[PDB]
Amino acid sequence: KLNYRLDTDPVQPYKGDPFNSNFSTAITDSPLARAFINNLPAYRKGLTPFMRGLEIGMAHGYFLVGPEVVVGPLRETAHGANLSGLITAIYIAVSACLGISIFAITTFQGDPRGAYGSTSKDSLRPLRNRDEWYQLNGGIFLGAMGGAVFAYLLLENFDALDSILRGGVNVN
């Protein structure tokens, strides 16, 4: 008389555990979502912590320059706007890296509290060692600085790059 109909349920319990506070949905358990998330630099199998931080830093530092260039208070001039965007990215990234450092300092004392304890099984938080976090932070800082400078160099050379991408450099 009682029919839960779990066998034909489109939404299944997460990883077969109905009591882990999660569901198997298109966002959490679909083949494409799993492939995309697990192969991001934060989760890609075999990556060293420094290489994880490098790829993350390059991506984030690159796009963090943009907002102040277009709608910032130095947007009236090209050179000033690009400098303000680079500085904003540097300030944000350095502040974030300072937060990462003090996170590692305070979390990894004795047996860490919460999701970073020895008995924790948080699959979304795999960096379980203090040395991994410092290697991550070094990659984050250097990657963010490099990505921010790369965006800054392209914007500083917007006129040259515009001629480059339109073939205007082939006149002479």
Partner 1 sequence: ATKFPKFSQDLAQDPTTRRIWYAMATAHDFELHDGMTEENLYQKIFASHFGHLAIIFLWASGVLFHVAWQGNFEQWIKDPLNVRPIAHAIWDAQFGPPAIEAFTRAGATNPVDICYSGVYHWWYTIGMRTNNELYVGAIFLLLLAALFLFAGWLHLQPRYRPTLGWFKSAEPRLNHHLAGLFGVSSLAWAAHLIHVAIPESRGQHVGWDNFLFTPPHPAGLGAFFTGNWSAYAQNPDTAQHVFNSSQGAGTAILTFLGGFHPQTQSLWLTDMAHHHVAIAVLFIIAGHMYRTNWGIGHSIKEMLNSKSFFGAKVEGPFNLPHQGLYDTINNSLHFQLSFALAALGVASSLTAQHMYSMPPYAFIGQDFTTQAALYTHHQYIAGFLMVGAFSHAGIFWIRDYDPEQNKGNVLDRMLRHKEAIISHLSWVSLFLGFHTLGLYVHNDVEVAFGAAEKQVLIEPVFAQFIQAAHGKALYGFNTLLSNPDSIASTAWPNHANVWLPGWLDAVNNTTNSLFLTIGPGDFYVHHAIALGLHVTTLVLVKGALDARGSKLMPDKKDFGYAFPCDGPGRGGTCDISAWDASYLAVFWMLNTLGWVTFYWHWKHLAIWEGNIAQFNESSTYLMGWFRDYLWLHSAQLINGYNPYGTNSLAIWSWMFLWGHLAWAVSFMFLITWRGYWQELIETLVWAHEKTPLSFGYWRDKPVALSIVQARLVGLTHFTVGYIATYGAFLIASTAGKFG
Partner 2 sequence: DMTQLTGSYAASWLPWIMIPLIFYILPFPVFALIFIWIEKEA
90 binds ligand F6C (CB under 6 A): no
32 binds partner 2 (CB under 8 A): no
Size of site (CB under 8 A) for a second copy: 40
76 annotated as ligand-binding: yes
Give the containing element (helix H, strand E) for 99: helix 78-107
Q: How many CB atoms lie within 10 A of CB 147?
A: 24
β-pairing verdict for 12-13 and 23-24:
antiparallel
Name which of Ca ion, partner 2, ligand F6C, none residue 105 binds, using a CB cut-off of 5 to 8 Å depending on partner kind.
Answer: partner 2
* Cα–Cα nearest to 136, from 89, 99, 90: 99
61 binds a second copy (CB under 8 A): no
C-alpha 89, offset from chain centre? 14
156 annotated as ligand-binding: no
Taking the C-alpha atoms of residue 72 and residue 151, their distance in angstroms, rounded to an integer, is: 16
CB of 51 to a second copy, least distance (A): 5
Among 6, 33, 40, 102, interactor with partner 2 by CB under 8 A: 102
23 bridge partner residues: 13
Name which of partner 1, partner 2, Ca ion, none residue 115 binds, using a CB cut-off of 5 to 8 Å depending on partner kind.
Answer: partner 1
Taking the C-alpha atoms of residue 35 and residue 16, their distance in angstroms, rounded to an integer, is: 19
Please list every residue from 57 through 76 that binds Ca ion, using CB under 5 A: 73
Taking the C-alpha atoms of residue 73 and residue 15, their distance in angstroms, rounded to an integer, is: 50
Name which of ligand F6C, Ca ion, a second copy, none residue 54 binds, using a CB cut-off of 5 to 8 Å depending on partner kind.
Answer: a second copy
Residue set of the binding site for Ca(2+): 73, 76, 169, 172
Residue set of the binding site: 42, 55, 60, 73, 76, 101, 169, 172
Residues engaged in binding Ca ion (CB under 5 A): 73, 169
